[PDB]
C-alpha cells in the first residue's frame, strides 16, 4: 500500500559543510528544487 517516505537535502548530500561547493552548486539552477519537489510529491502520494 505504501512506500518508505524519504526527504533528501540536496545541498548537504552534494556539498556537506562546504560553502565553496554550495556556491558552485548554485550555478546548476533549480535541480535541487526539482528533486525536493519530487520527493515531497512521493511522500504525499504514499500518505494518500
Amino acid at each position: 500500500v505504501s512506500m518508505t517516505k524519504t526527504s533528501v537535502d540536496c545541498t548537504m548530500y552534494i556539498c556537506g559543510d562546504s560553502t565553496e561547493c554550495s556556491n558552485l552548486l548554485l550555478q546548476y539552477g533549480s535541480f535541487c528544487t526539482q528533486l525536493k519537489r519530487a520527493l515531497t510529491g512521493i511522500a504525499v502520494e504514499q500518505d494518500k
Partner: protein
C-alpha cells in the same frame, strides 16, 4: 571520486588553492548530482 583526487571535500579545500579546488569540487558535484537524479528517478518509478 568520479575522477577527483579525493572523495572528501575537506581534503580538496585543505590541499588545493581555490582555482584547482573548483575543478575537483565540480567533478564531485557532477557525480553526486547524477547520483541524486538517478535515485529520484527510481523512486518516482517505484512510486508509480
Amino acid at each position: 571520486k568520479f575522477g577527483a583526487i579525493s572523495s572528501v571535500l575537506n581534503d580538496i579545500l585543505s590541499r588545493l588553492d581555490p582555482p584547482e579546488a573548483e575543478v575537483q569540487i565540480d567533478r564531485l558535484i557532477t557525480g553526486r548530482l547524477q547520483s541524486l537524479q538517478t535515485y529520484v528517478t527510481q523512486q518516482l518509478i517505484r512510486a508509480a
